[PDB]
Design a protein around this ligand. Structure first.
Ligand SMILES: CCc1nc(N)nc(N)c1-c1ccc2c3ccccc3n(CCCOC)c2c1
Ligand SMILES: *[C@@H]1O[C@H](CO)[C@@H](O)[C@H](O)[C@H]1NC(C)=O
Length: 333
């Protein structure tokens, strides 16, 4: 099965899923960076404005709902959500699985008021599941209907005309329609995390970063490519970028000229051009231009690690192989 994804300003990729009977729909981000499923709850006080602006699942309208109520708190690098567990049938572009998800009752205005999506579907391993809840992919695999134990991601570039698909996620394989050349796999450092060994990072012709090696987290639920506060400060100085509050800007006229940034993974340089990582929204020297790379200190046991999010996936079609515990990359088409 494949799921059409909507691309919102190149920073948010989501698709639809139905929960309960009759189906209650939600826009969700398929996150290889987390392992739980959650959507806003009707029990969420309207004092939480974010709940006022998103779809809320109502248990009392689902004849297939199974109560549980165990509390859970999900913690992401850029925000937190809290609530309790519930069970019901979830629809994912064809497949139907009885999933255990979290009904969020605390959805902070900042940042969720900025979210176009309603919730999250974790595509990570159970080792990272909060509350030891079985991840949705594990369940789908159990059904034994998928052609292969893998899922692929395709994140298209932004578009000013609602006629091109913002992205697509395939359950059980890849879609040749969106990649060229062959994949090039890398082995997961440790199973339970979509993290691989990254040999080095280069900014132009001078591998000034991640020498000696470092970690790379392939996060479909993250907007940009991130690095330790240290690594980024050093990468950003090399680009002549200034550090703002939430991002790094560069004078727009200097954006097209910026150097390439390469990530050495499994022996193959994945190169990104300035056009690939800069939000060139102007050419004025009197305007600032946001870079699609941020600084995000990810704690143990996962970090310190770089995070390859949407900025990286837009250029490289990614396939997550559960059966071989490996990640594959191919030129996105
Ligand atoms: C999908 C959940 C998620 N997973 C992971 N691994 N990291 C995150 N930082 C987030 C997380 C949390 C809140 C918001 C969040 C809140 C408001 C606006 C945008 C937001 N984004 C970016 C969406 C990127 O989609 C590809 C968020 C991401
Ligand atoms: C909630 O689900 C977990 C997972 O199986 C289960 O162990 C627990 O007993 C459930 N709690 C209730 C009260 O339904």
């Amino acid at each position: 099965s494949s799921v059409i994804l909507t691309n919102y300003m190149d920073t948010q990729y989501y698709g639809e899923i139905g929960i309960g009977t009759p189906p209650q729909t939600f826009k969700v981000v398929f996150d290889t960076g987390s392992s739980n499923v959650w959507v806003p709850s009707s029990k969420c006080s309207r004092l939480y404005t974010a709940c006022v602006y998103h779809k809320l699942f109502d248990a009392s309208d689902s004849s297939s709902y199974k109560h549980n109520g165990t509390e859970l708190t999900l913690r992401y690098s850029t925000g937190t959500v809290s609530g309790f567990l519930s069970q019901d049938i979830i629809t994912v572009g064809g497949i139907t699985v009885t999933q255990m998800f979290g009904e969020v009752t605390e959805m902070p205005a900042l940042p969720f008021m900025l979210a176009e999506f309603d919730g999250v579907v974790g595509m990570g391993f159970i080792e990272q599941a909060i509350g030891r809840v079985t991840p949705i992919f594990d369940n789908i695999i159990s059904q034994g209907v998928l052609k292969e134990d893998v899922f692929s991601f395709y994140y298209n570039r932004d578009s000013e005309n609602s006629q091109s698909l913002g992205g697509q996620i395939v359950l059980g394989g890849s879609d040749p329609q969106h990649y060229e050349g062959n994949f090039h796999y890398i082995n997961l450092i440790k199973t339970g995390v979509w993290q691989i060994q990254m040999k080095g990072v280069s900014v132009g012709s001078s591998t000034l970063l991640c020498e000696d090696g470092c970690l790379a987290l392939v996060d479909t639920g993250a907007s940009y490519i991130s690095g330790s506060t240290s690594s980024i400060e050093k990468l950003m100085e090399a680009l002549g970028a200034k550090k703002r509050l939430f991002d790094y800007v560069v004078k727009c006229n200097e954006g097209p000229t910026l150097p390439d940034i390469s990530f050495h993974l499994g022996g193959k340089e994945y190169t990104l051009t300035s056009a690939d990582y800069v939000f060139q929204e102007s050419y004025s020297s009197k305007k600032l231009c946001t870079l699609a790379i941020h600084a995000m200190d990810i704690p143990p046991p996962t970090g310190p690690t770089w995070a390859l999010g949407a900025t990286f996936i837009r250029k490289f079609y990614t396939e997550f192989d559960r059966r071989n515990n490996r990640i594959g990359f191919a030129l996105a088409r």
